From Swiss-Prot, chain A:
Residues annotated as domain ATP-grasp: 122-298
Keywords, comma-separated and alphabetical: Acetylation, ATP-binding, Biotin, Disease variant, Ligase, Mitochondrion, Nucleotide-binding, Transit peptide
Outcome of swapping A225V: In MCC1D; associated with a reduction of wild-type residual activity
UniProt GO MF annotations: ATP binding; biotin binding; biotin carboxylase activity; metal ion binding; methylcrotonoyl-CoA carboxylase activity
Gene transcribed to yield this protein: MCCC1
Name of this chain's protein: Methylcrotonoyl-CoA carboxylase subunit alpha, mitochondrial
InterPro entries noted in UniProt: ATP-grasp, BC-like_N, Biotin_BS, Biotin_carboxylase_complex, Biotin_carboxylation_dom, Biotin_COase_C, Biotin_lipoyl, CbamoylP_synth_lsu-like_ATP-bd
From Swiss-Prot, chain B:
EC number: 6.4.1.4
GO molecular function, a single term: ATP binding
Family: Belongs to the AccD/PCCB family.
Gene that this sequence comes from: MCCC2
Entry-annotated residues carrying N6-acetyllysine: K48, K461, K477
Name the UniProt record assigns to this protein: Methylcrotonoyl-CoA carboxylase beta chain, mitochondrial
General function of this protein: Carboxyltransferase subunit of the 3-methylcrotonyl-CoA carboxylase, an enzyme that catalyzes the conversion of 3-methylcrotonyl-CoA to 3-methylglutaconyl-CoA, a critical step for leucine and isovaleric acid catabolism.
Result of altering V305M: In MCC2D; severe form
Effect of G46V: In MCC2D; uncertain significance
Keywords, sorted A to Z: Acetylation, ATP-binding, Disease variant, Ligase, Mitochondrion, Nucleotide-binding, Transit peptide
Effect of I407T: In MCC2D; uncertain significance
Pathway: Amino-acid degradation; L-leucine degradation; (S)-3-hydroxy-3-methylglutaryl-CoA from 3-isovaleryl-CoA: step 2/3
Length: 651, 529, 90
């Protein structure tokens, strides 16, 4: 019950950084909590104080109510911000904070409990007059009872779609080989934002659309939701406002409604999670909701009246994930060797919890970041989103960025005809195979390797005493003749041979197959990213160039191409097998042990035989992973020095 | 252009393998044993002696070194185990003297401090040998010598082993005079009593510092009136600087070194340092403590060289010996390590390699794990002795800095060919599992079991199998006891017993110190072709 | 005010921090005699430091020594010698 000057953030990752940013702009001191893995995390370095809450598993760290309360007491934090997930929807934790005199920055326990129970929330919501969806949740399965409930809900219903009473029995038996709801093409999910003060006043921010869903996880959020009439927008929000006042709602909140078509909507659930799709609403209404939440939690009234709240433009939110679309959106954990994003501006807001050089971990959700763009109309905002997504680049792990670009490109999305089967219906179109690269792109990659070598020559020159030597030039010039370099690069599974002639002017003439290209270029650095400015046959382009391992990565506004540099066999270590055909006896000695049968599959480092020579034990090891063709010696045999011990099948 | 990609040595060991588990457990116990014994030696004379030492206002010898060297700089102590069980009933922790290499005012110096808490700082025979070894190291590497003098004179009961001979106490002053003539600074800090020969140390030094009341100098032994800082500082003139206390004297010493007008210059090419690609503690499992089992020396190399990069020379010829080029902390090094019994090809391969390193002025590192030379009628007919001698003769004449590390057995003439103590390596270190002797314990036992089996078979009285172990068991016990690393290190045969995990750091510090002296041209004798 | 740092002469900054945190000033109960009336609380004596602060001071001194070592290393030919480290290893 005090003004908040210090706040503990009982969360990690991006949400923790977002809450902290509002606190810094407000002068409120910030306390982080952290696990052993997140010791160097961005939210730890961002806080004014940070405390360890134990090991990496969240059950023993971020979900440990006792440790969070202990840190809040030890840091003298007056308030706890739970963020989203973890303890944010835990009734016990909220009551414990109230018992210990710490301000929980979130809703009252009564609201958390009432919303949590589906029956209680629906009963109050029907009392609020909010339209309700009709479903049968009864455990009883008698075919007669299920059929009577299907009639009461009215056809069509979902068990198997049931369009009429005559088909009910066949569809029920098919589904069994139950719960009944209402079926219809109802895939538009429209949600509203409501804020309520301790004084009981409430305002409605404009609605958003979360219709697009992948693996039961929302992917794209657009505010205001497309196609909603100005009059419908007022009515939908006012119903949410009346419902919030009736339940005495305090703090931020999201009320969800379901519209199949023709502006017919019904309540689904109300969430106190402070959903992370909040940024789109903030941009359209020009308000900071984290700031409003901190002020309201302290006890202040809602900052703006409903008349003051206004809707401007359109915003889109896209969440980057480390999930790999090819393995059915499988989550991936790996080092982020390169991370870059679209430049920040009032129109373009990037919300991220990770930095270049950070490592993604299986312990927590893999979402890399959330990207928000703002513009006057939906189509213009969509164009900006694609422009920004192309400017988002990640190297070192798999990402959903390509899938997002394809989805935004799809014509139906641009129309605004969004339904939650969008990904299954257009699955073939959304996932597309790589096409063969153009010869021009291959020329750019070759230039990139040549220019990188020139930079390496320059680095050595700086150390050298003879800085101005003509040899340190990268001219590749011979007396009376021109140097042509034969270089091979691999695109996909295809080896490409490029012949590069180093011209006197400093340009390079490259011939791939029967086509000759005149290429000139330079490497320039903006920020920490090297960029290649190049002209091929007079067409000029700029791309970001990263060469890591044996792969050349060129990222351009048009597209990203990855080309491979072939690895020499001697370095490949296939040569190590070639250096000797068979393992021989180290010295003349008795064979004490044989570990291989006449036909046995062995891997390099598998012991084959043990030999004692002059009372000195030697263990013979498998040179290759090849299966054993034959054995030349048995136990107790004396083997002469350098005599073949094992024969390996030719491969 | 240094952008070429290259192959790297080393392989990931099988941590689950029983052999690795056993080897790690055995080696770990040896390292723990080594650590706790040093802790005891760290305490010097004991609580009563230490309490008395502090009661006089003097710093403890190891605290003096801590304050003398640059803040936070590593200190390479040498021969920590000198005098360990050397004398029957007398305990002499560290020999009564602490020697090592540390950085003073940014300059690498040799520090020689008497431990007054140990027998009042008296000079035992091992104490003289330890000091003489330190002086030899300083001269060969042109390291300034700092003497923290607090001594009680020679130990009379053992005078015959201290005073008379060439390598006895007299040699200490000879070394000081020679180093001074070569512009290797000699700095003496009298922080206590020095009597008889002790008084010569401050007198023979280029610059000298004495504490106000603790320090005393006199050829013939109140002590303050006879000696004392005031008498020497103001009347005798033996003192160059006058210090209020131990802290003041150490501060003055740092100023003296800063005025040496010395700057280090490197004769070798330098490249940026890189850590090895494999953990060093894996050496515990790879090597173990059983000398009968064999391991690939390349595994040891892969875990100490920069980036685990190694260019092997003559890989398929004389494979029992491994030679190649690498870098440690940026310095170039040529590595020679045993990988089996020495053969004629191995000796020839080594001789060729040593000539290459000497020609290019590349420091040499030897990794001794020997089991002997090839034994056979054919090998002798082909001049294995002639081949083995080729290597002994090349190694002796090499003028590049040489460092030897005994990671296993060291027996017979194999020791000489691999730059043993007799061949003046700049430093010599041993792992806690090493064994050194004229021959392996078993060979001496078996050889005797031939001589006396013959003795009684040829004489005609039968000599039974039980008579054999009344012959063999005492021999094996003797060689095991005298080949133990502590036995070798108690006497100054090596410069210390080092934990394998510390091998890379010790080598880096040692090579860095050895580079203070310019590398000379190598002149070889006649190569008996 | 905490971010403002002034070394070389005495300032009223700590007095302003005590004044701006006084309960009657927070309430807005101000008058021309406020400073005379609350002089005892506004002028605050020094209190003994916590052991954590002493640890931080020692760490700062050690890190300053390490920085000095790096500065010296910059001008040396033996740039990568292990002796240039501040590990304090034995």
């Amino acid at each position: 019950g005090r003004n908040i000057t210090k706040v503990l953030i009982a969360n990690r990752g991006e949400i923790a950084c977002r809450v902290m940013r509002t606190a810094k702009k407000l002068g409120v001191q910030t306390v982080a909590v952290y696990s052993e893995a997140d010791r160097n995390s961005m939210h730890v370095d961002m806080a004014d104080e940070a405390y360890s809450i134990g090991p990496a598993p969240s059950q023993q760290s971020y979900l440990s109510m006792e440790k969070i309360i202990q840190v809040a007491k030890t840091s003298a934090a007056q308030a706890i911000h739970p963020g989203c997930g973890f303890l944010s929807e835990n009734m016990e934790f909220a009551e414990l904070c109230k018992q210990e005199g710490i301000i929980f920055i979130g809703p009252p326990p009564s609201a958390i409990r009432d919303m949590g129970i589906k029956s209680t929330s629906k009963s109050i919501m029907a009392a609020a007059g909010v339209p309700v969806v009709e479903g049968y949740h009864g455990e009883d399965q008698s075919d007669q009872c299920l059929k009577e409930h299907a009639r009461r809900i009215g056809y069509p219903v979902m068990i198997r779609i049931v369009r009429s009473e005559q088909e009910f029995q066949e569809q029920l038996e098919s589904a069994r080989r139950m719960l009944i709801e209402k079926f219809v093409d109802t895939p538009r999910h429209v949600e509203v934002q409501v804020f309520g003060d301790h004084h009981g006043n409430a305002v409605y921010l404009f609605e958003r659309d979360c219709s697009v869903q992948r693996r039961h996880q929302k992917i794209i959020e657009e505010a205001p939701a497309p196609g909603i009439k100005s009059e419908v927008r007022k009515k939908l929000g006012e119903a949410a406002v009346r419902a919030a006042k009736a339940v005495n709602y305090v703090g931020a909140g999201t009320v969800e409604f379901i519209m199949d078509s023709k502006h017919n909507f019904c309540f689904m659930e109300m969430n106190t999670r402070l959903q992370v799709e909040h940024p789109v609403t903030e941009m359209i209404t020009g308000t900071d909701l984290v700031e409003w939440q901190l002020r309201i939690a302290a006890g202040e009234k809602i900052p703006l009246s409903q008349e003051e709240i206004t809707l401007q433009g359109h915003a889109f939110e896209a969440r980057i994930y480390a999930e790999d679309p090819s393995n059915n959106f499988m989550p991936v954990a790996g080092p982020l060797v390169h991370l870059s994003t679209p430049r920040a501006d009032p129109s373009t807001r990037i919300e991220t919890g990770v930095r270049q050089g950070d490592e993604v971990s299986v312990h927590y959700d893999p979402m890399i970041a959330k990207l928000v763009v703002w513009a006057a109309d939906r189509q213009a905002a969509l164009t900006k989103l694609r422009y920004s997504l192309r400017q988002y680049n990640i190297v070192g792990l798999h990402t959903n960025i390509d899938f997002l670009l394809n989805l935004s490109g799809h014509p139906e999305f641009e129309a605004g005809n969004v339904h939650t089967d969008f990904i299954p219906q257009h699955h073939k179109q959304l996932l597309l195979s790589r096409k063969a690269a153009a010869k021009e792109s291959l020329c750019q990659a070759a230039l990139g390797l040549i220019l990188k070598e020139k930079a390496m020559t320059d680095t050595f020159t700086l150390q050298a005493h003879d800085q101005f030597s003509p040899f340190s030039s990268s001219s590749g010039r011979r007396l009376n003749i021109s140097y042509t370099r034969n270089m091979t690069l691999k695109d996909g599974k295809n080896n490409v041979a490029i012949a590069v002639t180093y011209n006197h002017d400093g340009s390079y003439s490259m011939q791939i197959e029967d086509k000759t290209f005149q290429v000139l270029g330079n490497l320039y650095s903006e920020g920490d990213c090297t960029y290649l400015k190049c002209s091929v046959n007079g067409v000029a382009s700029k791309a970001k160039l990263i060469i890591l391992e044996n792969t050349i990565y060129l990222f351009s506004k048009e597209g990203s191409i990855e080309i491979d540099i072939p690895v020499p066999k001697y370095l490949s270590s296939v040569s190590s097998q070639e250096t000797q055909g068979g393992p021989l006896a180290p010295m003349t000695g008795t064979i004490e042990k044989v570990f291989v049968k006449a036909g046995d599959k062995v891997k390099a480092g598998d012991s084959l035989m043990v030999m004692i020579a002059m009372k000195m034990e030697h263990t013979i090891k498998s040179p290759k992973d090849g299966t054993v063709k034959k054995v030349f010696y048995r136990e107790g045999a004396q083997a002469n020095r350098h005599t073949p011990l094992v024969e390996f099948e030719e491969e | 252009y240094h952008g070429d990609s290259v192959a790297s040595l080393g392989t990931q060991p099988d941590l689950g393998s029983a052999l690795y588990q056993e080897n790690y457990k055995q080696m770990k116990a040896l390292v723990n044993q080594l650590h706790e014994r040093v802790e005891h030696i760290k305490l010097g004379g004991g609580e009563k002696a230490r309490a008395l030492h502090i009661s006089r206002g003097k710093l403890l010898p190891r605290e003096r070194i801590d304050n003398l060297i640059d803040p936070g700089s590593p200190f390479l102590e040498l021969s920590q185990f000198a005098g360990y069980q050397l004398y029957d009933n007398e305990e002499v922790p560290g020999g009564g003297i602490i020697t090592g290499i540390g950085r003073v005012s940014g300059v690498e110096c040799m520090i020689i401090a008497n431990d007054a808490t140990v027998k009042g700082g008296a000079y035992y025979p091992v104490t003289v040998k330890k000091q003489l070894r330190a002086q030899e190291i300083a001269m060969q590497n042109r390291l300034p010598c700092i003497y923290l003098v607090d001594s009680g004179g020679a130990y009379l009961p053992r005078q015959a082993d201290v005073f008379p001979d060439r390598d006895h106490f007299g040699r200490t002053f000879y070394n000081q005079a020679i180093m001074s003539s070569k512009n290797i600074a000699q700095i003496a800090v009298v922080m206590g009593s020095c009597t008889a020969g002790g008084a010569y140390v401050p007198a023979m030094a280029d610059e000298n510092i004495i504490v106000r009341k603790q320090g005393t100098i006199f050829l013939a032994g109140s002590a303050e009136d006879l000696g004392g800082a005031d008498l020497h500082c103001r009347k005798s003139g033996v003192s160059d600087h006058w210090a209020l206390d131990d802290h003041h004297a150490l501060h003055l010493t740092r100023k003296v070194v800063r005025n040496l007008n010395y700057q280090k210059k490197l004769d070798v090419t330098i490249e940026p340092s890189e850590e090895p690609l494999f953990p060093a503690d894996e050496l515990y499992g790879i090597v173990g403590a059983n000398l009968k089992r064999s391991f690939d020396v390349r595994e040891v190399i892969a875990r100490i060289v920069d980036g685990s990069r190694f260019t092997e020379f003559k890989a398929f010829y004389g494979d029992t010996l491994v030679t190649g080029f690498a870098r440690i902390f940026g310095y170039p090094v040529g590595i020679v390590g045993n990988n089996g019994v020495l053969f004629s090809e191995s000796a020839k391969k080594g001789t060729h390699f040593v000539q290459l390193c000497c020609q290019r002025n590349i420091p040499l590192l030897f990794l001794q794990n020997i089991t002997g030379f090839m034994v056979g009628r054919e090998y002798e007919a082909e001049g294995i002795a002639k081949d083995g001698a080729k290597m002994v003769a090349a190694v002796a004449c090499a003028q590049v800095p040489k460092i030897t590390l005994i990671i296993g057995g060291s027996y017979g003439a194999g020791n000489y060919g691999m730059c043993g103590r007799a061949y003046s390596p700049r430093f010599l270190y041993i792992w806690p599992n090493a064994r050194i002797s004229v021959m392996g314990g078993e060979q001496a036992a078996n050889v005797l079991a031939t001589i006396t089996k013959d003795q009684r078979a040829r004489e005609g009285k039968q000599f039974s199998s039980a008579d054999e172990a009344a012959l063999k068991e005492p021999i094996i016990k003797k060689f095991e006891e005298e080949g133990n690393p502590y036995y070798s290190s108690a006497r100054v045969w090596d410069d210390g017993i080092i934990d394998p995990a510390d091998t890379r750091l010790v080598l880096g510090l040692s090579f860095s110190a050895a580079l203070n002296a310019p590398i000379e041209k190598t002149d070889f004798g006649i190569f008996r072709m």
